[PDB]
Design an enzyme around this catalytic site. Structure first.
Site, PDB file in Angstrom:
ATOM      1  CG  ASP A  35     131.767 -13.577 -52.265  1.00 22.37           C
ATOM      2  OD1 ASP A  35     130.587 -13.897 -52.451  1.00 22.37           O
ATOM      3  OD2 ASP A  35     132.654 -13.638 -53.156  1.00 22.37           O
ATOM      4  CB  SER A 199     113.384 -20.296 -55.291  1.00 22.07           C
ATOM      5  OG  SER A 199     112.169 -19.576 -55.127  1.00 22.07           O
TER       6      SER A 199
END
Length: 330
Positions: A35, A199
């Protein structure tokens, strides 16, 4: 040193991935959920409330000759999905795919929430975010990667998740046969303890690319792609019959519909998520309504590039003095 381990979807939908981890002496092998959105290595154990264990493999510290109680230490974590767990701490030898850390903090669960009990396939979590998020008190503990880093050939690990198939976590090296083209690296902020990056934009199907900054985290521990409501709306508007259902808790669509791809930007580079990756099947057995793999982050407070996004790429988690993230197509 290096390590290399196969990671395997827990079910036919890729709801999560499990990776075998050796703990203690002699080795006790547990299947952990790697994770990159958290920083605790915790396991089902002989100390876990009996009623809360239902099929998981447990770690028994008393059977490990290298286990040492971390005296006074406790831990307690709550995850973004409402799940939680807590307990005490041992240090022990932990190996992943050939790579061994001695003195790793292994957080032994005394209590786990129902969602963990109900998932027989996940024996615990191995956190790979920054150690500043680790919940051990009074003395914060380091992640497996943090402990291994100085010994690794290169201070990196990589995530190569499969679509409806096994993939690979590598430690200490970049497998240049595992991706196409080049790796585009992008800046990371560690200020919230995550692999947080920006992004450069998105496209829906064959649509034109929209240049817009999307701050989010690369999180192998989250199944879906959570993005701003505007972005998500633009995606599902291109799916005939798609709707946001408050009772279901997100966008659903008829399984007879064709899903467009979703493209996200990494600098000037582009990662394409095929439409099929965005199908998470019937909301309930026999239903013609399917759950979508791109959902709104509104009210999470952060955008999450979860498995739906990451499994479309070869991803480098670069733990150099200034961390960065790398993405390649594959």
């Amino acid at each position: 040193s290096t390590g290399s381990a196969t990671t395997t979807p827990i079910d036919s939908l890729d709801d999560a991935y499990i990776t075998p981890v050796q703990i203690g002496t002699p080795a006790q092998t547990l299947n952990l959920d790697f994770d990159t959105g958290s920083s605790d290595l915790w396991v089902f154990s002989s100390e876990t409330t009996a009623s809360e264990v239902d099929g998981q493999t447990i770690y028994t510290p008393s059977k490990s000759t290298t286990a040492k109680l971390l005296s006074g230490a406790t831990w307690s974590i709550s995850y973004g999905d409402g799940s939680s767990s807590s307990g005490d701490v041992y240090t022990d030898t932990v190996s992943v795919g050939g790579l061994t850390v001695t003195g790793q903090a292994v957080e032994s669960a005394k209590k786990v929430s129902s969602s963990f009990t109900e998932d027989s396939t996940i024996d615990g979590l191995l956190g790979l975010a920054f150690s500043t998020l680790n919940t051990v008190s009074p003395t914060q503990q380091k992640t497996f990667f943090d402990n291994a880093k100085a010994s690794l050939d290169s201070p990196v690990f990589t995530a190569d998740l499969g679509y409806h198939a096994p993939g690979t976590y590598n430690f200490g090296f970049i497998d240049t046969t595992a991706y196409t083209g080049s790796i585009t690296y992008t800046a990371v902020s560690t200020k919230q303890g995550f692999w947080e990056w920006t992004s450069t934009g998105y496209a829906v199907g064959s649509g034109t690319f929209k240049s817009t900054s999307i701050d989010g985290i690369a999180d192998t521990g989250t199944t879906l792609l959570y993005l701003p409501a505007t972005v998500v709306s633009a995606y599902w508007a291109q799916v005939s019959g798609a709707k946001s259902s408050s009772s279901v808790g997100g966008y659903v669509f008829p399984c007879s519909a064709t899903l467009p791809s979703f493209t996200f930007g990494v600098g000037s580079a582009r990662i394409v998520i095929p439409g099929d990756y965005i199908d998470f099947g019937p909301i309930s057995t026999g239903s013609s309504s399917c759950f979508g793999g791109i959902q709104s982050s509104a009210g999470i407070g952060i955008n999450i590039f979860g498995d739906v996004a990451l499994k479309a790429a070869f991803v480098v988690f670069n733990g150099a003095t200034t961390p960065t993230l790398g993405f390649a197509s594959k």
